[PDB]
Amino acid sequence: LYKKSMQEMFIVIKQHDNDCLWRVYAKKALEDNDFDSAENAFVQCKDYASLKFLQRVRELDDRERQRAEIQCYFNKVEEAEEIYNKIERRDLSIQMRMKLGDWAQVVDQIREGTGQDVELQKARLELGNYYAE
Amino acid sequence: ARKCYTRIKKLDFIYLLEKAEKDFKKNTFVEGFYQGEIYALQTKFYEAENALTKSNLASQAKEMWIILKEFDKAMRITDTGASPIN
């Protein structure tokens, strides 16, 4: 995989046809910003949720939002926050954090950042509900 | 629903959730399509196909099931499903 190209990788991996090998092939394909190989791997793996993920992904303009959404899709969010920060446009990061359900991080980000009162009050109410439950 | 889908880290289900809440106010909000999408979000597909075939959603089932590239069974479904457009 690491030295040879993609098509002979697919050809040599079709014989084994294992879940782990397909998963690793798809991860390698998406890491190299390739979607045709990634969608082929997900189709071969019979995973509908990942296909919905890729279908949602493909309608993006910039070259960096795709990276961030993929990397926050995998298991990890801090690097996505950092790439948002270097791209700026922070309200995107705030929306990502609030939809992910983590409220303490949202409260920390809002504090001393913009000073807007309404979303701070809403986030504090949500955090209080989260602590009460 | 949002609280339950947030307590456990899930991304596709919550996406379908805000899609449903945005679509609730305007469109008819037929529960068959959303039930079938919930069923198809897992690995079990046949009961989702049956659910979409139950009330009337053959065309949406066809367009939903095309995306995963096994066109033969999509043709099997389209042999029975119709297209009432024009």
TrEMBL record, chain A:
Domain of life: Eukaryota
IFT80/172/WDR35 TPR domain boundaries: 21-108
Coiled coil regions, renumbered to chain: 63-90
Location in the cell: Cytoplasm, Cytoskeleton, Cilium basal body
Protein name as it appears in the record: WD40 repeat protein
Full protein stretch here: 665 to 797 of 1195
Automatic annotation (TrEMBL), chain B:
The name this protein goes by in its record: Intraflagellar transport protein 122 homolog
Shown part of the complete sequence: 627 to 712 of 1251
Taxonomic lineage of the native organism: Eukaryota, Sar, Alveolata, Ciliophora, Intramacronucleata
Subcellular location per the Swiss-Prot or TrEMBL entry: Cell projection, Cilium
